[PDB]
Design a protein around this ligand. Sequence first.
Ligand code: VG5
Length: 370
Amino acid sequence: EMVDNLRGKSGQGYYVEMTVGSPPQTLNILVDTGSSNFAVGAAPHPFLHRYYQRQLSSTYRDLRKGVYVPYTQGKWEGELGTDLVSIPHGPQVTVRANIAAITESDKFFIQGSNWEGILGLAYAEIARPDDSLEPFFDSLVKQTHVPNLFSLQLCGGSMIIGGIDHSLYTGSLWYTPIRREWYYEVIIVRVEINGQDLKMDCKEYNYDKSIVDSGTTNLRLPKKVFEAAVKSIKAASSTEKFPDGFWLGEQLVCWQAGTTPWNIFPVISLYLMGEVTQQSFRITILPQQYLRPVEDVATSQDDCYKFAISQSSTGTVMGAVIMEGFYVVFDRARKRIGFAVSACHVHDEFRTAAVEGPFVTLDMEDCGYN
Ligand SMILES: CCNc1cc(C(=O)N[C@@H](Cc2ccccc2)[C@H](O)CN[C@@H](C)C(=O)NC2CCCCC2)cc(N2CCCC2=O)c1
């Protein structure tokens, strides 16, 4: 009953239905493994179809403390409190959780996105104002008998809370360690573009951290890695030449409907640290993932795309574009993240997204930046 409980797209996020308060107020909440605050619109906003009304909830408790949260994209401020929370298409439980009532915001809410709030699924270490503000998932686990694990199949999609749904993936689940419990931090040991190694000291891939982040759209790479990757992707696709603006995400690329030349763009393989010394596995993604479709009836004689790999000065972010088509298990209990090919893997008649291993490195270097 938890299958297909997500709606949305990489560009504007994936969201799950929740209720807050007593009597229950229904809100759509973006699922974000890249933050740790649970927050809902709690005042009128041009892009909000609805919002949390604390005055109507008899179970609302004000903590008399304000909070401010900046993201890569957008920021908000609100008032902290607690209230009862349920998930209609998740486990049938009711938890009292911390909730930030958003009363001011800038470039956070998205026009026509259909969500009114955000569920930060990462660890307390990155919650605001500080790590004493217990995150929702921790409250869920402490107060119910729900196992300390969840999985995401982003396609719509599914969030399976408390376990793994085997009908959502094929083949093997490969696990990479959670290096530190704050973000879901992982380690990338190798990057290939069409099978060709970028030939970088592997610490560069994780400067200064690498995270798995359902709340970010793009694959975001450290500048040095980004430049190397774009150079290689340009070379692989050189049968066609695009404006610099495209590679910077400042411009769409369009082809006549149905003629997108997928085959001129390379596959990208990210090798993740395994659970055993010097072993790794790889996930391979196709251009169908990193060229993000931009829907617009005005342009619809064409199919148009944005380049969904971009630069970062705060480390690698494996965003929704990377997670799409994979079944990703956030196994908090065992401090590891699992990857498998999803029931909604994309692929065409020549190539397929994949998760495969084991691979061995002869290099003993630790790829962690710190
Ligand atoms: C889905 C919307 N698209 C979209 C969203 C973000 C973004 O900032 N998402 C946040 C959630 C969100 C979701 C929807 C709307 C706003 C924010 C995540 O929480 C980001 N996670 C890490 C990187 C972070 O900054 N965490 C903070 C650390 C400090 C304490 C609080 C958590 C970034 C891009 N970007 C920016 C450049 C390339 C890209 O894809 C596109």
